[PDB]
Enzyme design. Structure first.
Site, PDB file in Angstrom:
ATOM      1  CG  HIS A   1       1.712   3.943  -8.513  1.00 34.12           C
ATOM      2  ND1 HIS A   1       2.071   2.618  -8.384  1.00 34.12           N
ATOM      3  CD2 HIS A   1       2.642   4.511  -9.313  1.00 34.12           C
ATOM      4  CE1 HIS A   1       3.174   2.396  -9.079  1.00 34.12           C
ATOM      5  NE2 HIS A   1       3.551   3.529  -9.642  1.00 34.12           N
TER       6      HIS A   1
ATOM      7  CG  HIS B   1      -0.597   0.839  -9.545  1.00 33.70           C
ATOM      8  ND1 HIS B   1      -1.660   1.656  -9.219  1.00 33.70           N
ATOM      9  CD2 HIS B   1      -0.516  -0.083  -8.546  1.00 33.70           C
ATOM     10  CE1 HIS B   1      -2.203   1.249  -8.083  1.00 33.70           C
ATOM     11  NE2 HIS B   1      -1.523   0.194  -7.657  1.00 33.70           N
TER      12      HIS B   1
ATOM     13  CD  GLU C   1      -1.164   0.878  -4.353  1.00 30.31           C
ATOM     14  OE1 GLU C   1      -0.204   0.297  -4.910  1.00 30.31           O
ATOM     15  OE2 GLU C   1      -2.351   0.583  -4.607  1.00 30.31           O
TER      16      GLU C   1
ATOM     17  CG  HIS D   1      -0.476 -11.417  -6.053  1.00 24.58           C
ATOM     18  ND1 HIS D   1       0.866 -11.524  -6.358  1.00 24.58           N
ATOM     19  CD2 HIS D   1      -0.624 -10.234  -5.415  1.00 24.58           C
ATOM     20  CE1 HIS D   1       1.504 -10.455  -5.909  1.00 24.58           C
ATOM     21  NE2 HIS D   1       0.626  -9.658  -5.327  1.00 24.58           N
TER      22      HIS D   1
ATOM     23  CG  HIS E   1      -4.191  -2.405  -7.451  1.00 23.88           C
ATOM     24  ND1 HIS E   1      -3.573  -1.809  -6.366  1.00 23.88           N
ATOM     25  CD2 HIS E   1      -5.459  -2.669  -7.055  1.00 23.88           C
ATOM     26  CE1 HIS E   1      -4.427  -1.728  -5.368  1.00 23.88           C
ATOM     27  NE2 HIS E   1      -5.584  -2.248  -5.756  1.00 23.88           N
TER      28      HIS E   1
HETATM   29 FE   LIG Z   1      -1.705  -1.161  -5.897  1.00 27.36          FE
END
Ligand SMILES: [Fe+3]
Ligand SMILES: [Fe+3]
Ligand SMILES: [Fe+3]
Ligand SMILES: [Fe+3]
Lengths: 419, 426, 425, 419
Positions: D347, D353, D330, D281, D324
């Site tokens: 975040h 998160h 973010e 990913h 993460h």
């Molecule tokens: Fe992230």
């Protein structure tokens, strides 16, 4: 008959007594004349050599020899920041105060990138003084660029003595100790205090290897030391504040020195002005004398720019500066020749400025031929960060209250039916 | 006449038929009008976007449709490098040959940084042509900067047609296909073949964001395709050699394109000349039109510099170019009129070469005139000289060294410079 | 065999306990009485990110050798081919009948410069039928090996690594090694890099993960030979083989640490990035390793692969586009078939599309691609690659005169039709 | 009907009257049609030309023709900074207020690197409006990135008119004057105010010379001017404040212009999405549309990143975004398709998160095949500096008070005796 060494950025070397400089090393065990070696590091040790500023001093007593600094009651720079104000601003020249006021006591905060307590970027003052300094001073807060407008200055520094008169500029590196004597009884002028990367010569681009301010014209004084016995006040500016201590010796006791961290002066009359020899009106960055960079390439902390006697030959061209809106912040002053010598204008970020109607009508109607601009010298301090006017500056009698009216009579000349 | 797109370095978009450019993408499965997408990459894929040059083509037949290339018997560029010779050199204008000679056949090697078989740096030619081209051509060894001196060119390229006359310049990107028609029966001019980083605008420094060659004046032609049905020779230059194949179609069959790898032209008359408005004589780099850099910052592979009409105002100044010795190598031409450091011997179509550290400068005549003159504003006019200045040594070809045009007594130009030194009188 | 992992790591490895000196590089009394020896792969003053150097702890100093003498057999001594701008394609190379070890069977295909003035990149296809009974180092550049037929057991000064097709291996300039053929004979490709050492590409927006992950780069553990007896030491210098004879094994490094190391990498572990929408991304997107130049963005060479991958681009001409490139494209094939060529391109084959040569798909790949209904499609069971170089690739005389050069390569594009119609969009 | 010029970073040229643009120069003495020349300098003069943004304007009246600006009583952005709060935050969509509120009046400050009076880095807003602007505005504090979510906008600028709908973005250069008209009665969307280096295309690295946002899809309006006579209010945002003056003419009177400092729009539906065609990913930096750099290479002031319709094909892979923890900050939004369109999530630095239990369970269990994500467009403003939520945002009803429970059911699936 002061003597000077020439060459911007040179590793200079000057001794007031024969052989006072150690030969072949900086730190002998037995220094000539029994002097103390002292290093003045104006930058980090690890800068690229091209950015490096450092001077070795050989002096009678170490700078370490001083008692504790105490905060002076008198603080010319402790005034607050002005309110938010986006307007175009213009001042008339600042009158010299009646009260006794030496060079350092006389700085009037005009505008700054930050509050005096957190020096960053550039702070701009106008100095007014009626007394010679009876003390020694250094600025811990930054480099000082002095632009005299009225009255000569005899500036005695650790590295030697230099005299500056209107049309000349001088720079005194951060932390360097100096004392200002007013040759003409009083003095007025402008200051750009550089809290950032030290001023240097601009990248010449296509202009090449010569032109603008030629390196040979930057002059640094020769060694000169004082032996006066008796008390002397030593003052420093630290985070906007004057703190002082009393020494029992003269701190201007440097007998010899070598290196690149040096005070200097430059005569603006020696500027090798470059401009259009064809048409149009070149960007005022072309008049750049000195510049202070940031880590952002191309965007200066500040550019010092002058508008000197020059030839005007642009054909089929509107010759005055064009109408302009700028990311950068333009602080204009005038050295000689509504805008008077000693006056100032601030057009901040995206403020719309340019010529008035009378300037426009005359330029459009002119029979264009080569013309010599003479007997004038203006300049600009242009900064990337916003310049916040001080409270003092916004409230002083010299602030013009109807400056916007200067542009009120601009007419439409638009005719859609005739190109 | 012809329509052009403005803006040096732009991502252009042009289509000869409506909607011929795919919208929203570069590589549709069913391309508009049944055309083939083709990518012309002028640089490595990974260049910084400011350094990127690539053009998407939408064309009738792919360029890949061609039979094997074969070496031609006729090779204009096959002559040996000349002997080692550090001398200052000056040539008179090159006459047009009698025999039938198109634009690609007409290149006369003057000087080059390297052998034609190992292209590096810059190669300089003077072209002489008396035939229009009835074939198509691409140079694989580099980018071509064209400086006409006599006769207008009509240049048909993959991206469209552009016409160039003396006082204008034209650039053709490496590998791009084109055909030169002589509008005036014959033509003569100069060529800088750039084997290095593509020519671009110089960093303006303190000049700022406007001045010298303004980007708005760089003109790129609009899309144009031919549909002729019958044999067309396609020639390419490769390692100094001309190699050809025969096509059964016109290779200028590009109906639309978009991108930044474009041919373009520039009118030198429009140069925003910057100079002294005070005293002294600015370095000639101030006259830079286009520059091709090396990996060494500040030291160009070549600078293209011009000497245009301009006001001379410097007070208390020796105005002509100063005496000079230079690491760089100075090749000068003249498009029209007369040059300001020189007196005779330098005519339009002429050339001079002053290589690494050769002593050059004005003559006795000029020095005398300049030192005595009553200095006043003076407009230099009706003249256009230029220089191709390179960092690498320029090695004259054997042909250049042996030709009738090479002036035998060039050194005698400085023979009469006198001493005016008087130690008792500053 | 055991390996250490991590591309570019400061590695540390000892075959005897405590053979590496702790806390310093150059002890007066070295553990086990070994000799300290520095292998400097780069200038001392490179930025640390670009530094390649290994400290070796060895039985005998590399300096213990008699004068090198020029060998009579000179594999790479053939002349440069003549000037030729044409598109070229070669069938697979036959393995010679004459006894030919790894270093003896380099067939020069194309190179940026003459073997005696090495610069940029030199490309070879190797063919061997004997295991090496000598040790070799290359003074002229770093070696990128791309096996296509037969596995290789490569003993280097720093240890032993085994490489099979679909793996690659890199051996630093100057590093001594011996090649054993585990399958009797071997064939494959070499990129000999005369410039800046190969490293991982800048990922740009791909960010901090993907393409070739550094964890997948594997370096052998220390191994040393104590064998007493004659051994031939051969070096490649300015294209020539020179040799001296030792009375000891030069693979006698008991312990080592540092960053100048041989490595291998399994291309099957490549974290392939592509379009998840439309169009056909530039093949730079498949970069495995790259060798930069002082010109930022213009590599000396990129090593790029064309691996198994998902094709999902909608409303898109999925094969590679017709192309003309400033760069020079040398392609090969490890196994299976390549998406841009219908036939004539086999494992072991090669193609060269030099500066501004017109290439692209054929009228058959074209036809199917324009005609095909588009759905997600897994391209599989193939691995092709490119050595793309900034400098022109001059084919050698051998390459141009060899029976494997296809005579009618251009004919692959001859039947491309005009489907142009000015009056329907 | 609106026509546009294409090509990100182009030197454009547009003229609403034949030959309104002076040919061969920028500053003629007798301008075509009697127009005035005005330079809009969006960067320092001495920027590398790749980073230069400046536009020459040829207009009916000079921008200097304005009286003194005065502080407006209504001030949308003066609300104080929220308190310190490291928590993950998520907001429900913002309601459009009842009171008449135009575009500039309806910015709700969501979170910012700094206080309104000292702009630095990025400030993030949600706009809600129910009136067309009947006046003209410029922002002195920074460049504006607009991301519509509900309702189309017709944005009239000095350089011409552009229309933006949800799934398109628009950028307006600092200091450029504009007017926003609502084509749908009201409008809502997101704003990234960029106070730093202007947004530009990201370095593609191995992606090469094409892909992501292709430069041909960046559209800039053609010249359009107004000749409406009568009082018009000009408003500027300076240090977070609205200041205004009254002109007796339209300031959208540019007959012709040329240069690179331009407004523009871009249709996100043309983004050439790149991602995995194998496994794993890829980092969301792969989805960057526009980025604002810092002087620190590789560390952006902000990245604007999108999560558009796209093919998911990764085999043997956990397909949703991984768990993460990030140095960067973010700020997520949703244009179409707990998290609704118009909602947002923050975040900040090192907050943990990732997917919820339901997402994990489904993803580990799925029979992976090619799958087209469709009819959904999310995005993120990722910034290097901490985003401090405004007081307003932290006390608003739309702030979801139980956001942390979203992760409360994550189970341990660990089993040490089964690899
Ligand atoms: Fe992230
Ligand atoms: Fe200005
Ligand atoms: Fe010269
Ligand atoms: Fe290719």
């Amino acid at each position: 008959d002061l003597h000077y060494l020439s060459g911007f950025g040179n590793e200079f070397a000057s001794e007031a007594l024969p052989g006072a400089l150690p030969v072949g090393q900086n730190s002998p065990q037995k220094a000539p004349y029994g002097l103390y070696a002292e290093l003045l590091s104006g930058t980090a040790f690890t800068m690229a050599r091209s950015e490096l500023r450092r001077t070795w001093l050989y002096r009678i007593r170490p700078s370490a020899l001083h008692p504790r600094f105490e905060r002076l009651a008198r603080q010319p720079l402790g005034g607050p920041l002005g309110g938010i104000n986006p307007n175009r601003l213009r001042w008339s020249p600042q009158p010299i105060p009646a009260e006794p006021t030496d060079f350092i006591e006389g700085w009037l905060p005009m505008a700054a990138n930050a509050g005096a307590e957190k020096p960053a970027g550039v702070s701009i003052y106008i100095y007014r003084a009626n007394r010679s300094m009876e003390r020694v001073f250094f600025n811990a807060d930054g480099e000082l660029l002095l632009v005299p407008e009225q009255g000569r200055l005899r500036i005695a520094t650790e590295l030697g003595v230099m005299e500056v008169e209107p049309l000349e500029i001088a720079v005194i590196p951060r932390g360097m100790k100096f004392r200002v004597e007013l040759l003409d009884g009083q003095a007025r002028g402008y200051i750009a205090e550089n809290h950032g990367a030290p001023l240097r010569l601009p990248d010449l681009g296509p202009i090449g290897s010569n032109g603008l301010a030629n390196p040979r014209d930057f002059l640094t004084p020769v060694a000169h030391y004082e032996e006066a016995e008796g008390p002397v006040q030593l003052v420093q500016k630290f985070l906007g504040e004057h703190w002082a201590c009393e020494l029992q010796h003269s701190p201007l006791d440097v007998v010899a020195w070598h290196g690149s961290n040096v005070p200097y002066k430059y005569d603006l009359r020696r500027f090798n002005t470059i401009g259009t020899v064809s048409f149009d009106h070149p960007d005022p960055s072309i008049f750049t004398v000195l510049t202070s960079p940031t880590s952002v390439h191309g965007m200066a902390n500040m550019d010092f720019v002058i508008f000197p006697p020059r030839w005007m030959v642009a054909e089929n061209t509107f010759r005055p500066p064009w109408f302009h809106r700028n990311l950068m912040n333009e602080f204009m002053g005038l050295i000689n020749g509504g805008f008077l010598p000693g006056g100032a204008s601030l057009h901040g970020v995206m403020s719309a400025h340019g010529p008035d109607a009378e300037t426009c009508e005359k330029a459009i109607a002119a029979d264009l031929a080569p013309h010599k601009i003479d007997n004038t010298m203006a300049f600009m301090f242009e900064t990337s960060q916003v310049l916040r006017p001080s409270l003092q500056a916004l409230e002083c009698p010299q602030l013009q209250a109807d400056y916007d009216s200067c542009w009120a009579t601009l007419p439409s000349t638009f005719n859609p039916n005739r190109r």
